A paper describes a structure:
Co-activator associated arginine methyltransferase ([name], or [name]) targets substrates that contain proline-rich sequences rather, than the GGRGG sequences favoured by [name]. Co-activation of gene transcription is effected by methylation of histone arginines: H4R3 by [name]; or H3R17 and H3R26 by [name], for example. Novel non-peptidic bisubstrate inhibitors and crystal structures of their complexes with [name] are reported here.
A difference in sequence at position [name] Asn-265, which corresponds to Tyr-160 in [name] was identified by analysing structural alignments of [name] and [name]. The second mutation, [name] [name] renders the substrate arginine-binding pocket more [name]-like. A modest decrease in the affinity of 8, 9 and SAH for [name] [name] compared with WT was observed while the Kd increased substantially from 1.11 to 143 µM for inhibitor 10. To investigate the structural origin of this effect, [name] [name] was co-crystallised with 10. As hypothesised the resulting structure revealed a conformational change in Glu-266, in which the glutamate adopts a conformation whereby the plane of the carboxylate group is almost parallel to the phenol side chain of Tyr-265. The effect of this mutation on the position of Glu-266 in the crystal structure of [name] [name] is notable.
Author numbering:
A (entry chain C), B (entry chain A): 135 to 476
Write the structure that this text describes.
């Protein structure tokens, strides 16, 4: 299938094994901003669900399907590839909703549905939106969408902005410099120091931060889920040109995302911005191994390029330059191996 | 090979991927008890290495091979299956030891060595000794050992002892009781509460603890690596009969291990006991689903059975009984999915 072809089997088994556990579901369910905002988006847009046919892509425990049922959906196909499908089935029965919610075990790229749907609902967003490549599965599912069907969420905005955080920078640097030791119990480790540095700086940093570290207004990159195709997400090129508001060392770029549920009654936003209450997505920072000095009024331009790999992730290339001085930094990150700093 | 036959490929890819990272090596290297004890065992037993041929099974960064070289080894075959092999090669060159340390990329069950060796060195120990099944690879390597060759470690002692920890016990129910909610955003979750409880009780708990929780002297199970065969580790039956030193509720069994390097000059012990300074192995606790009351002077008997599986791990079965009252408990645990509580 389209899933097995883009996904090395060892990565797929690990991914679905992880989402099979109830403890993991509990952790996600306890994000009240996430769960409450989804419920509000669906219930306040009840006319988008009332007597409709719906597809829930990667339903997990089933909660979004339950919200669709509360909003009056006639039928909800709830697709789930992990063993969480069986637990969702238990909930559908114990909540007396077997007349409305039909769990379909398997990958959305592989199952067969009996009819086309009015609306697709999902939570495909990983860290910095793209982590884990579930957006592709969400877009793949549009093969089941009727003409003029809706998607919830409808659009995603990724935000990026340059930051200064000496302290985060020194922490990661200090760890790599363990390998600058000429006599670790008599052994010279220093030949591996560059490799060690590269490995640490390749890890995106998942945690939150004060907005005062941000040195320019964010640049926004939008994915319209109604219009994008799966293959659009294999290579994502995000140009940027920042007008620097503060002078200092730029240690990297910070990322967050918002999604909008554009319903008939209203648009509901779910934001993971650092100006908003914390979610289990936190925010993500990509460090530069060599920081860039810039003054307020300078332009910091470059490109953030995400290249999908078969480990169900992306290799991230970031090249940035201070236009006024020609100072450049170029950096590679492995979105599969984040540093969970919180 | 013997490795591929006992190990599902998806488990093997995940395992060697994990040991490929320098940060993981750094973590192990920074365990001073571990690294210092290995160095001391090798250097203080220099006559076991001086002008000898050695095999380092799973050499990682190469550190033990460097210690063998410091002790005078004539030649060291350093076998490693992860991409850490390439970093080891870099260190061998930068430490000017290419004439004495030969790095061999691959699994010890699959590579070919040109000659038999005087002594095998390794660090095959996982949590509770047996986690990750590397002891089998270590024993497999005795096909390369000369008659009367030595093994470093030599022997391993697994210790088990009953513990009381009411807060650890209750923590499982507190977490599972998230599911005991009749209207989580309108949804009755309660039907999943037993499944949640079951899931948490299958996870062995990796962390340390105060020795005051221990209710009896440990029972010891010894593997003599000079004498054991690979197949001895496929099914490990550990009977126990504890003479209780304290009255109270027994919530489960705690596990730790020691290994001894029995050299010609001296025996050096590496202990992960909770009476010793903490190592990166911590200790491990397996809960009983139902606690058992016992008085000081009673006997708590039963069996701990470890059954090797193709996920490169063990299913752990524990049955226990207070002889004087006939009160019995069991559990089944999955050593592949430990709870890292530290
Ligand atoms: N192709 C596929 N076919 C069928 N099923 C798929 C496919 N792909 C993934 N699945 C399942 O979709 C579920 C994913 N969840 C993950 C939630 C968002 N992800 C995050 C969030 C934060 C950080 C990182 N990641 C969606 C939310 C759902 N409403 C729920 O309640 O979980 C998991 O159970 C997955 O197994
Ligand atoms: N069949 C095999 N063929 C060839 N190579 C194998 C095989 N199997 C495993 N390897 C390698 O052995 C290395 C593992 N050891 C670390 C083991 C510790 N494990 C723990 C520790 C704590 C908790 C849990 N687990 C490195 C020690 C080395 N002396 C050094 O100091 O770096 C890793 O590089 C593995 O890839």
């Amino acid at each position: 299938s389209v899933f097995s072809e883009r996904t090395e089997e060892s990565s797929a088994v690990q991914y679905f094994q992880f989402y099979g556990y109830l403890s993991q579901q509990q952790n996600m369910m306890q994000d009240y901003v996430r769960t409450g905002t989804y419920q509000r988006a669906i219930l306040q847009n009840h006319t988008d669900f009332k007597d409709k046919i719906v597809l829930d892509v990667g339903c997990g425990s089933g909660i979004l399907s339950f919200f669709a049922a509360q909003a009056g959906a006639r039928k909800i196909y709830a697709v789930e590839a992990s063993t969480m499908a069986q637990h969702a089935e238990v909930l559908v029965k114990s909540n007396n909703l077997t007349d409305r919610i039909v769990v379909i075990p398997g990958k959305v790229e592989e199952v067969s549905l009996p009819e086309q749907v009015d609306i697709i609902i999902s939570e495909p967003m990983g860290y910095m939106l793209f982590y884990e490549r579930m957006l592709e599965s969400y877009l793949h599912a549009k093969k089941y969408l009727k003409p003029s069907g809706n998607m919830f969420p409808t659009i995603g905005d990724v935000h990026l902005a340059p930051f200064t955080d000496e302290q985060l920078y020194m922490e990661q640097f200090t760890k790599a410099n363990f390998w600058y030791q000429p006599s670790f119990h008599g052994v010279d480790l220093s030949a591996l120091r560059g490799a060690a540095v590269d490995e640490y700086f390749r890890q995106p940093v998942v945690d939150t931060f004060d907005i005062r570290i941000l040195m320019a207004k964010s640049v926004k990159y939008t994915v319209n889920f109604l219009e994008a195709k799966e293959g659009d997400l294999h290579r994502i090129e995000i140009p940027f040109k920042f007008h620097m508001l503060h002078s200092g060392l730029v240690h990297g770029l910070a990322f967050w995302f918002d999604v909008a549920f554009i319903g008939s009654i209203m648009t509901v936003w779910l934001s993971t911005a650092p100006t908003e209450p914390l979610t289990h997505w936190y925010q993500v920072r990509c460090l530069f191994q060599s920081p860039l000095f810039a003054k307020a009024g300078d332009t910091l331009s470059g490109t953030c390029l995400l290249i999908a790999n078969k480990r169900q992730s992306y290799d991230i290339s970031i090249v940035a330059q201070v236009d006024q001085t020609g100072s450049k930094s170029s950096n590679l990150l492995d979105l599969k191996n984040p540093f969970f700093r919180y």
